[PDB]
Design a protein around this ligand. Structure first.
Ligand SMILES: O=C(O)c1cccc(-c2ccccc2F)c1
Length: 242
């Protein structure tokens, strides 16, 4: 069911880094990784939490649809793309933390905890501040656990409406061409050691789907582009994408 290929570590060590990539072949129900131990180690989800947060906000009516405008609160932040109005699509695309912090405040502790348990999401622990627990609270999730959650979303099997799941999968759209579609979400965790980057999602082909979840050491922001680049290089090596 699971195969470990330690030779794939070169994808990370060649960049003076360390990390894990986990792949899941949906048709064959088989998984692959470079490091079984790190594949099951739990990290802060950081901005990958925008996936469950979006689902919960939509299903509770906190967000009406993907067109609703969330007005900039007028506070200048150091990320230029955050100093503007957003909807669900652009908030996901630019990982706009302050929009999702307001989502969480409106969801509230009780409903957030209840829904993460219903999702079987990570350690299901929202200890910390309701508007930042996915950045510096007690919640943790592993790469393998990300795969399990994403598979439920793909199949519309999460305990929210089909509509809510379709809208979030639209918002996850990252790349599409004549060969494949990628729906995914990046993450960047800096408030608790070790600092890491995430990329989780899946690749749609004509006749199969490959789920993926990766994290890697991220001592500075200079390496953030390696999250997608390394993953796509693994996918190409495995002849999943051209
Ligand atoms: O990688 C991203 O999509 C992304 C989106 C928003 C902010 C950031 C970021 C970059 C450097 C330092 C702190 C940060 F939050 C990264």
């Amino acid at each position: 069911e699971w195969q470990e290929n330690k030779s794939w570590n070169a994808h990370f060590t060649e960049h003076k880094s360390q990390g894990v990539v986990v792949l899941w072949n949906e048709n064959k129900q088989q998984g692959f990784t470079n490091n079984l131990k790190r594949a099951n180690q739990a990290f802060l989800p950081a901005s990958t939490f925008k996936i469950p947060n979006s689902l919960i906000a939509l299903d509770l009516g906190v967000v009406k649809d993907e067109h609703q405008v969330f007005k900039w609160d007028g506070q200048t932040r150091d990320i230029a793309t955050w100093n503007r109005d957003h909807n669900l699509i652009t908030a996901m695309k630019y990982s706009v933390v302050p929009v999702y912090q307001e989502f969480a405040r409106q969801i509230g502790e009780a409903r957030m905890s209840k829904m993460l348990h219903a999702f079987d999401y990570g350690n299901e622990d929202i200890s910390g501040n309701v508007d930042s627990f996915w950045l510096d609270g007690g919640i943790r999730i592993s790469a393998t656990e990300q795969i399990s959650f994403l598979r439920k979303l793909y199949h519309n099997k999460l305990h929210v409406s089909e509509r809510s799941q379709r809208i979030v999968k639209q918002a996850m759209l990252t790349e599409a061409n004549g060969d494949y579609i990628i729906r995914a979400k990046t993450g960047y965790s800096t408030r608790i050691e070790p600092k890491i980057g995430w990329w989780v999602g899946w690749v749609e082909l004509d006749d199969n789907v490959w789920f993926f979840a990766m994290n890697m050491d991220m001592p500075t922001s200079d390496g953030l582009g390696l999250r997608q680049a390394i993953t796509k290089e693994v996918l190409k090596q495995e002849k999943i994408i051209p």
